[PDB]
């Protein structure tokens, strides 16, 4: 009972904490594979391996991390409160994850065409903005708790 209102608190933390750092690694995907196709346009300097390196090498380690950190906040089911904005965030979570792992694919292989062709800022657009909304339930959800 009362000793209970510490599990919950803990849990909407943590679930949060996890969204947060999820979110960070996507965007810190973004950039590796924008500093990663920049160079791998038509320049020199670092004149190695052949369209996969360092930075692209990066980008496979932060989405990763993003992916692993997120496969938490998929596990611990969430509450009936948070069901909804879950599975939104879930929901475009999924579709921005894919993205990122394709760009991934293009570079790898030099699909400099496909990969400037995908449509990725509205992919991360929906995420951020039911990221928001999911805060904007989380942080409520205590609101109401005095």
């Known amino acids: 009972m009362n000793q209970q209102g510490f599990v919950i608190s803990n849990e909407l933390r943590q679930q949060q904490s996890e969204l947060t750092s999820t979110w ?36 496979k380690t932060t989405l990763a991390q993003a992916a692993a950190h997120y496969a938490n906040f998929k596990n ?4 009936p409160a948070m069901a909804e904005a879950s599975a939104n965030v879930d929901e475009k979570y999924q579709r921005y994850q894919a993205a990122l792992a394709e760009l991934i694919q293009f570079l790898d292989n030099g699909n400099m065409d496909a990969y400037f062709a995908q449509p990725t800022q509205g992919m991360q657009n929906a995420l951020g903005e039911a990221l928001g909304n999911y805060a904007r339930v989380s942080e409520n959800l205590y609101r109401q708790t005095f």
């Not at 611990?76 to 509450?79: K, Q």
């Open 24 to 59: 960070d690694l996507m965007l810190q995907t973004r950039i590796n594979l924008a500093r990663s196709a920049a160079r791998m346009m038509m320049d020199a300097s670092n004149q190695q391996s052949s369209a996969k390196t360092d930075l692209l090498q990066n980008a």
């Open 76 to 79: 611990m089911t969430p509450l």
